[PDB]
Write an enzyme that holds these catalytic residues in place. Structure first.
Site, PDB file in Angstrom:
ATOM      1  N   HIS A 126     -14.547 -27.407   5.439  1.00  0.00           N
ATOM      2  CA  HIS A 126     -15.159 -26.509   6.404  1.00  0.00           C
ATOM      3  C   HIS A 126     -15.753 -25.323   5.670  1.00  0.00           C
ATOM      4  O   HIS A 126     -15.401 -25.042   4.523  1.00  0.00           O
ATOM      5  CB  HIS A 126     -14.198 -26.098   7.535  1.00  0.00           C
ATOM      6  CG  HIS A 126     -12.947 -25.416   7.079  1.00  0.00           C
ATOM      7  ND1 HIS A 126     -11.693 -25.809   7.505  1.00  0.00           N
ATOM      8  CD2 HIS A 126     -12.746 -24.333   6.287  1.00  0.00           C
ATOM      9  CE1 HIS A 126     -10.783 -24.994   7.000  1.00  0.00           C
ATOM     10  NE2 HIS A 126     -11.398 -24.096   6.255  1.00  0.00           N
ATOM     11  N   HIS A 138      -4.532 -18.933  -1.459  1.00  0.00           N
ATOM     12  CA  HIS A 138      -3.940 -17.995  -0.523  1.00  0.00           C
ATOM     13  C   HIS A 138      -2.649 -17.434  -1.143  1.00  0.00           C
ATOM     14  O   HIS A 138      -2.105 -16.447  -0.667  1.00  0.00           O
ATOM     15  CB  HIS A 138      -3.647 -18.691   0.797  1.00  0.00           C
ATOM     16  CG  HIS A 138      -4.877 -19.043   1.574  1.00  0.00           C
ATOM     17  ND1 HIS A 138      -5.613 -18.103   2.269  1.00  0.00           N
ATOM     18  CD2 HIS A 138      -5.547 -20.217   1.700  1.00  0.00           C
ATOM     19  CE1 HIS A 138      -6.682 -18.679   2.779  1.00  0.00           C
ATOM     20  NE2 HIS A 138      -6.669 -19.961   2.449  1.00  0.00           N
ATOM     21  N   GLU A 149     -14.975 -25.275   1.735  1.00  0.00           N
ATOM     22  CA  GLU A 149     -13.690 -25.378   1.081  1.00  0.00           C
ATOM     23  C   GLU A 149     -12.999 -26.673   1.414  1.00  0.00           C
ATOM     24  O   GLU A 149     -13.087 -27.193   2.520  1.00  0.00           O
ATOM     25  CB  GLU A 149     -12.797 -24.183   1.385  1.00  0.00           C
ATOM     26  CG  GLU A 149     -12.376 -24.062   2.819  1.00  0.00           C
ATOM     27  CD  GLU A 149     -11.514 -22.835   3.059  1.00  0.00           C
ATOM     28  OE1 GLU A 149     -10.566 -22.578   2.288  1.00  0.00           O
ATOM     29  OE2 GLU A 149     -11.790 -22.128   4.036  1.00  0.00           O
TER      30      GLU A 149
HETATM   31  N1  LIG Z   1      -9.639 -15.942   3.064  1.00  0.00           N
HETATM   32  C1  LIG Z   1     -10.648 -16.639   3.562  1.00  0.00           C
HETATM   33  N2  LIG Z   1     -10.431 -17.627   4.416  1.00  0.00           N
HETATM   34  C2  LIG Z   1     -11.613 -18.240   4.822  1.00  0.00           C
HETATM   35  C3  LIG Z   1     -12.892 -17.971   4.469  1.00  0.00           C
HETATM   36  N3  LIG Z   1     -13.794 -18.789   5.113  1.00  0.00           N
HETATM   37  C4  LIG Z   1     -13.072 -19.616   5.737  1.00  0.00           C
HETATM   38  N4  LIG Z   1     -11.736 -19.292   5.664  1.00  0.00           N
HETATM   39  C5  LIG Z   1     -10.641 -19.898   6.405  1.00  0.00           C
HETATM   40  O1  LIG Z   1     -10.454 -19.218   7.646  1.00  0.00           O
HETATM   41  C6  LIG Z   1      -9.041 -19.047   7.881  1.00  0.00           C
HETATM   42  C7  LIG Z   1      -8.888 -17.858   8.806  1.00  0.00           C
HETATM   43  O2  LIG Z   1      -9.529 -16.799   8.152  1.00  0.00           O
HETATM   44  C8  LIG Z   1      -8.422 -18.920   6.465  1.00  0.00           C
HETATM   45  O3  LIG Z   1      -6.980 -19.042   6.464  1.00  0.00           O
HETATM   46  C9  LIG Z   1      -9.264 -19.961   5.658  1.00  0.00           C
HETATM   47  O4  LIG Z   1      -8.939 -21.352   5.824  1.00  0.00           O
HETATM   48  P1  LIG Z   1      -8.178 -22.273   4.832  1.00  0.00           P
HETATM   49  O5  LIG Z   1      -6.786 -22.175   5.281  1.00  0.00           O
HETATM   50  O6  LIG Z   1      -8.844 -23.538   5.107  1.00  0.00           O
HETATM   51  O7  LIG Z   1      -8.443 -21.719   3.505  1.00  0.00           O
HETATM   52  C10 LIG Z   1     -13.134 -16.887   3.620  1.00  0.00           C
HETATM   53  O8  LIG Z   1     -14.223 -16.494   3.192  1.00  0.00           O
HETATM   54  N5  LIG Z   1     -11.930 -16.238   3.237  1.00  0.00           N
END
Ligand SMILES: Nc1nc2c(ncn2[C@@H]2O[C@H](CO)[C@@H](O)[C@H]2OP(=O)(O)O)c(=O)[nH]1
Ligand SMILES: [Ca+2]
Length: 104
Positions: A40, A92, A58
């Site tokens: 996504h 994370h 990602e």
């Molecule tokens: N930290 C972070 N999460 C992102 C970003 N874009 C998408 N996400 C996803 O959006 C969720 C809510 O912000 C995050 O926990 C992360 O999913 P993932 O768990 O798939 O990494 C980004 O630029 N930064």
């Protein structure tokens, strides 16, 4: 030595390439896997200086070495773009809430 170290997890360039190919394959087919629908869009809220152009996506990279197929994605992610170029490897682990940091 690790090419990418996400917290305690150690990845080689080969681990990253293998995960990236999987994620990109689903992306070109308009398919998704996992309760959290991977791959996504990765928004880059953190503003990492990826040298590769957006949009970014990602996909989970697993410490077991297995390719992600649903289930728990863990905390590590390979980030790639539309041209199947690696933007970076992020995690994370060591970041508050839903934030992310780069794997060193
Ligand atoms: N930290 C972070 N999460 C992102 C970003 N874009 C998408 N996400 C996803 O959006 C969720 C809510 O912000 C995050 O926990 C992360 O999913 P993932 O768990 O798939 O990494 C980004 O630029 N930064
Ligand atoms: Ca490995």
């Amino acid at each position: 030595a690790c090419d990418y170290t996400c917290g305690s997890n150690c990845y080689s360039s080969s681990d990253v390439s293998t995960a990236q190919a999987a994620g990109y394959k689903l992306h070109e087919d308009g398919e998704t896997v996992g309760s959290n629908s991977y791959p996504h869009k990765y928004n880059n809220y953190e503003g990492f200086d990826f040298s590769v152009s957006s949009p970014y996506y990602e996909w989970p990279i697993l410490s077991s070495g297995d390719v992600y197929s649903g289930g728990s994605p863990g905390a590590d992610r390979v980030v790639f773009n539309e041209n199947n170029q690696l933007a970076g490897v992020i995690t994370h682990t060591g970041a508050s809430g839903n934030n992310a940091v780069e794997c060193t």
